[PDB]
Design a protein around this ligand. Structure first.
Ligand SMILES: [Mg+2]
Ligand SMILES: [Mg+2]
Ligand SMILES: [Mg+2]
Ligand SMILES: [Mg+2]
Ligand SMILES: [Mg+2]
Ligand SMILES: [Mg+2]
Ligand SMILES: [Mg+2]
Ligand SMILES: [Mg+2]
Ligand SMILES: [Mg+2]
Ligand SMILES: [Mg+2]
Ligand SMILES: [Mg+2]
Ligand SMILES: [Mg+2]
Ligand SMILES: [Mg+2]
Ligand SMILES: [Mg+2]
Ligand SMILES: [Mg+2]
Ligand SMILES: [Mg+2]
Ligand SMILES: [Mg+2]
Ligand SMILES: [Mg+2]
Ligand SMILES: [Mg+2]
Ligand SMILES: [Mg+2]
Ligand SMILES: [Mg+2]
Ligand SMILES: [Mg+2]
Ligand SMILES: [Mg+2]
Lengths: 210, 132, 48, 102, 119
RNA sequence: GUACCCCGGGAGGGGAGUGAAAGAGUUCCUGAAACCGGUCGCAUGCAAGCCGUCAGAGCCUGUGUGGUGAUGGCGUGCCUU
RNA sequence: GGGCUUAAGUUAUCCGCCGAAGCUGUGGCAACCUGUGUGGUUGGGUAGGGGAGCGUCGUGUCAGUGGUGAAGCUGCCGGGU
């Protein structure tokens, strides 16, 4: 299935039409592959700043606590041995990075399938803009009522071409706003609708396509 | 929870029966040595108990006596009962805080000394409750 | 419409870790090493 | 009047109106099953021959399904580390004897 | 992700100390002693569940012997006679008769007597 | 952060007050186990016991399930090595 | 061991019986193979190999839930291999 389809550019009521090129927005949704890509994405978000002290890094503990023989006590070599209260930790966490070297083709295919899953569910909308003039949150909150204001993702273009739209949707808390060059599988699988801006869809389609 | 009659010492020692009680907490005497006298005093008439404890050679007889007297006094103030028609219905000794100390022994050794304490509880009731 | 909670791996993709020395219902006590000797504690070099 | 009857590798002494526990059968509650008689005692009269016991029918009514006691098995041998935990219930069929007709 | 052991650890301790809730001394109070005793109890109970069959059969055989010797027949001859007569009443029901219905047992003794080889 | 009253040399307690809660009273959130006891039920002073297990009377309870359990059989701990 | 020659001793022979977690009966569970509508075989186990799971903590998402009472602790009545 690679049929390119036509969707209604809206701007509230009606505008021109926009193509969903099929090579993306109509491909197989691969659940294992999308799961791998999303897990890798959530692993790359990990700070990984967890460390513990081994028996050599704990303060003191240099000298033998008592003699090897004759005391009637068990043999001990240090006060910071791991079985001591206050001693070192054996296999505790140490700082690490969790980012995975996922192949590019897999990431692109997973984003494609995630987009197609809801292009076939008719949850993708294209608008010219969400706001006229200055930055209201009320106006584009009214405008994003192409569906229920719940788990929506607003795809706008650049950090400057849609400054007004970005600042408008910034505070909705049920809207995740992305630039078209930063489209990722996690935010698409998380979204219940995608609302592209016209220029955002243009940027995404031009960046990656056949 | 949201239930009535929060637990109390009176409800567990007497439970709507006439009578009273007293507790001497943190008595600097071992629980076993207090029990050696409490076993004598349990079940006896209260006035007989205090007069006998006046003559008991043991050191724990002076704390326990006071507790009994206090219990009697309480019964003479919240219940209107007289001292001569009260009997020691219940009596027990629990352990208190035990302090740790060191006694130096021979050859650089130190042995442990435990300074034990006791809580003494005495519950008195009218003599008519002995058979009821 | 897949949503994030319906993403699951392929069957057999994520094999469970075998945690050793966690009781004798599994590889417990000696943890697969046997008793005594060199192999009980370190390893043997392959050139040896 | 009573009978020694057999029901699934076990024998029971039944009388009319007796609630008896039987090895599980495939029959629904309220159905009427038949127990094969091995002896009939009517008072100073004991039926024991096969030809006469073939005539006698013991009929009972299936009450429901009961459970045996819960059994904990813990197989153990010292100085090996070997243990094996297991459980058992052993469901049965409760039955009410409704007739012993010669 | 540091985990504390108590919440998971106390479950088996509560189970074992509930299973040891009539034992004498340390066996009913301490989890380690109670665990040793429950190992022994499980071995004993598994063994005695199998030995119960033989124990009850021995008791039935003794009672049948006693009841058939009052009628001048030994147990071996009584059992052989019931086998030859075709009456397949097992020793459990035979003992139940020998206690509760002694007249039926005596009639069974007569049946066994009439079915002996007599040789 | 317990006025005041009672027993007491005090400690402690009993009434009372504050507080939603004081068995949240300064040893103060929660308050486990070992361990220490008071009370009640059963058993226990002719008995040889890895302390259990199976069979099992009696008593108490019956919240018709539960506690204890005389007596009979069987039965030499756990781990390491 | 008691006791046994009035054998309960040795011996030959005959007729019965007892006796295991063996075998059969009945009721569950499980592994493998097999025609793929019969079922058959199998299921003691240390070192050890393989397979599949319980519980604890953190965490994405979804659905929630909690002073009309969460966690934790402690009873009783149940449940599963
Ligand atoms: Mg050092
Ligand atoms: Mg060194
Ligand atoms: Mg430290
Ligand atoms: Mg000196
Ligand atoms: Mg071990
Ligand atoms: Mg070793
Ligand atoms: Mg060796
Ligand atoms: Mg080796
Ligand atoms: Mg090297
Ligand atoms: Mg090798
Ligand atoms: Mg061995
Ligand atoms: Mg082992
Ligand atoms: Mg058998
Ligand atoms: Mg005040
Ligand atoms: Mg409380
Ligand atoms: Mg506290
Ligand atoms: Mg006696
Ligand atoms: Mg002996
Ligand atoms: Mg078998
Ligand atoms: Mg096996
Ligand atoms: Mg093994
Ligand atoms: Mg609510
Ligand atoms: Mg928690």
């Amino acid at each position: 299935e690679t049929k390119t389809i036509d969707v209604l550019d809206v701007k509230g009521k009606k505008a021109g039409s926009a193509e969903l090129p099929g090579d993306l927005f109509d491909v197989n949704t691969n659940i294992p592959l999308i799961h791998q890509v999303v897990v890798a994405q959530l692993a790359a978000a990990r700070q990984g700043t967890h460390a513990t002290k081994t028996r050599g890094q704990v303060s003191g503990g240099g000298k033998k606590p008592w003699r090897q023989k004759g005391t009637g006590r068990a043999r001990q070599g240090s006060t910071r041995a791991p079985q001591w209260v206050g001693g070192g930790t054996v296999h505790g966490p140490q700082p690490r990075s969790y980012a995975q070297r996922t192949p590019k083709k897999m990431v692109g295919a997973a984003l494609r399938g995630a987009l197609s899953d809801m292009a076939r569910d008719n949850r993708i909308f294209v608008v010219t803009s969400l706001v006229d003039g200055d930055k209201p949150s009320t106006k584009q909150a009214k405008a994003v009522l192409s569906g229920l204001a719940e788990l929506r993702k607003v795809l706008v273009v650049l950090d400057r071409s849609d400054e007004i739209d970005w600042l408008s949707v910034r505070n909705l808390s049920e809207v995740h706003v992305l630039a078209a060059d930063q489209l990722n599988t996690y935010d698409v699988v998380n979204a219940r609708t995608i609302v592209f801006s016209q220029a955002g869809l243009d940027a995404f389609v031009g960046a990656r396509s056949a | 929870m949201s239930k009535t009659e929060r637990p109390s010492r009176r409800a567990a020692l007497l439970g709507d029966r006439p009578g009273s009680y007293a507790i001497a907490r943190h008595v600097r005497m071992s629980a076993s040595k207090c029990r050696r006298v409490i076993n004598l005093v349990r079940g006896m008439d209260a006035v007989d108990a205090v007069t006998m404890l006046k003559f008991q050679p043991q050191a724990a007889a002076e704390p326990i006596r006071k507790v009994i007297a206090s219990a009697m006094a309480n019964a003479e103030q919240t219940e209107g009962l007289r001292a001569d028609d009260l009997y020691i219905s219940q009596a027990f000794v629990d352990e208190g805080i035990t302090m740790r100390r060191i006694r130096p022994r021979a050859k650089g050794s130190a042995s442990r000394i435990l300074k034990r304490s006791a809580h003494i509880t005495v519950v008195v009731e009218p003599k008519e409750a002995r058979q009821a | 419409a897949i949503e994030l909670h319906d993403l699951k791996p392929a069957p057999g993709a994520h094999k469970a870790k075998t945690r050793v020395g966690r009781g004798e219902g599994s590889k417990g006590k000696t943890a697969g090493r046997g008793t005594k000797g060199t192999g009980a504690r370190k390893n043997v070099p392959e050139f040896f | 009047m009573y009978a020694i009857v057999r029901s699934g590798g076990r024998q029971h002494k039944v009388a009319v109106g007796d609630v008896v526990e039987i090895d599980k059968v495939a029959d629904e509650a309220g159905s009427s099953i038949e127990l094969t008689p091995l002896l009939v005692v009517d008072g100073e009269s004991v039926t024991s021959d096969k030809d006469a016991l073939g005539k006698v029918k013991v009929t009972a009514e299936v009450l429901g399904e009961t459970k045996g006691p819960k059994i904990r098995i813990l197989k153990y041998k010292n100085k090996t580390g070997y243990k094996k935990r297991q459980g058992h219930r052993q469901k049965y069929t409760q039955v009410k004897v409704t007739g012993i007709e010669g | 992700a540091r985990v504390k052991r108590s919440v998971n650890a106390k479950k088996k301790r509560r189970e074992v100390l509930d299973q040891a809730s009539g034992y004498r001394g340390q066996r009913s109070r301490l989890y380690r002693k109670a665990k040793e005793q429950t190992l022994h109890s499980a071995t004993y109970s598994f063994r005695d569940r199998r030995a119960k069959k033989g124990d009850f059969r021995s008791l039935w055989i003794q009672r049948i012997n006693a009841a058939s010797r009052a009628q001048g027949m030994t147990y071996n001859r009584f059992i052989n006679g019931l086998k030859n007569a075709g009456v397949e009443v097992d020793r459990k029901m035979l003992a139940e008769l020998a206690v509760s219905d002694i007249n039926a047992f005596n009639s069974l003794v007569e049946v066994a007597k009439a079915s002996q080889p007599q040789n």
